[PDB]
């Protein structure tokens, strides 16, 4: 079961409702935070009465959860951007393939815009949103050994004033609906349509349908994709506590009652929670006076157990035991895999550094390995394709480096590479960029044509 929850914003009352249902009516008893800012129940033995009762609804609707940057550095921008994510979500509610949309607040790309069909990049002036840069056509799904499939980054269309948001959102969806491949589902996605007809042709039709003309793209840059683990100062006397939750799996573990700790926080929390695109949770809008109380519960529940920057910047999809399409373990493999990576980082004197490392259970790519600096794509039990060369901000697809290898083989490759990066990297140079500069891996410059060797 998966819920519609634009921007990952969920109330504490709604949380208590899902917490109950998870514990009592499911086989696993867990709440699994997803990387699209929502949650899932696993092994449902209905839910819709419970969801509906707290103002929630589980999503032929070819639409997924609309994402929104969860913790902007310019705190006051969130309310507006969030309002827009909710409106787009409602506006699109009832396509060839499924349609994924986001609202991004630079300089953060935590929502990983390049994995989505439609992206509205917020442009603000004097603390107020004035418009959006539209980027269209991202998607990560591939099929092993099938060179007709490819991961693709989103293309810039142009800038549009806030007022034209919904019309533009509608024009993109309808154009894709009409132009999308009407036979082969594995080529129906927007990324394929754009490559077939061309960005300008698609862009022109969108302008025609929306009744507008796109303005030149307004400047924007991204500095990262990670969450801001810990306390950050929000607006007023408010603070936001982001908790690192490994694999977003919320369950009570012996000596680490993560699920109960969150229920306890939900009961005393003023504001609401925010599920992030990195499968973490933000206890949002905590008044300064409440910080200590909240911190006490989170601390004792094991929710604030310190982890390395590496673990904080690693991600995996659900995979086994519940995913029917799984080829290799992802969620269940990640913890110990990162234990090994942590050793390698210490051995090389870079324990304070991080590499955006992701493991996806099969090429469908839910773990977003195809936008990682180091991506592992499951091929069979215990075997993965190793991709290198993405960057920290997620604007480049990593090329396949080694194919169908096992963990021991993966660690050996990374031990050597991390060692080279540690001694050869320039000031503040990321691992991915380093592999590309050092000639370790050829970059992917135009995915539709050069992703496959
Ligand atoms: C939970 C999540 C991974 C995670 O650990 O967070 C997930 C889990 C699954 N995804 Fe997904 N996907 C998740 C994000 C994505 C992503 C990343 C993103 O959206 O940011 C992608 C890659 C980007 C893209 O779409 O290109 C993604 C691409 C897919 C695909 C391939 C779609 C395609 O266009 O080919 C499938 C398979 C399909 O739909 O045919 C799929 C299918 C599925 C299913 C529902 C398998 C199925 O069809 O029965 C998996 C459920 C496993 C389980 O046991 O829970 N999922 N999946 C995310 C659910 C997000 C959500 O709340 O909606
Ligand atoms: S990438 Fe494959 S294994 Fe992982 S959750 Fe998605 S469909 Fe399942
Ligand atoms: K996480």
Curated annotation (Swiss-Prot):
Entry keyword Plastid = no
The entry's siroheme-binding residues are 366
Check the record and name the PROSITE patterns matching this protein. NIR_SIR
Co-factor(s): siroheme; [4Fe-4S] cluster
Which InterPro entries does the UniProt record give? CysI, NiRdtase/SiRdtase_haem-b_fer, Nit/Sulf_reduc_fer-like_dom_sf, NO2/SO3_Rdtase_4Fe4S_dom, NO2/SO3_Rdtase_4Fe4S_prot, NO2/SO3_Rdtase_4Fe4S_sf, NO2/SO3_Rdtase_FeS/sirohaem_BS
Q: Which GO terms describe its cellular component?
A: sulfite reductase complex (NADPH)
Entry superkingdom: Bacteria
Q: Which Pfam families match?
A: NIR_SIR, NIR_SIR_ferr
- Any keyword Membrane? no
Q: Which residues does the annotation say bind [4Fe-4S] cluster?
A: 317, 323, 362, 366
Q: Any idea what job this protein has?
A: Component of the sulfite reductase complex that catalyzes the 6-electron reduction of sulfite to sulfide. This is one of several activities required for the biosynthesis of L-cysteine from sulfate.
The entry's family comment says:
Belongs to the nitrite and sulfite reductase 4Fe-4S domain family.
Please describe the quaternary structure of this protein.
Alpha(8)-beta(8). The alpha component is a flavoprotein, the beta component is a hemoprotein.
Name of the protein in its database record: Sulfite reductase [NADPH] hemoprotein beta-component
- Species in which this protein is naturally found: Escherichia coli (strain K12)
Lineage at the top is: Bacteria, Pseudomonadati, Pseudomonadota, Gammaproteobacteria, Enterobacterales
Q: Which gene encodes it?
A: cysI
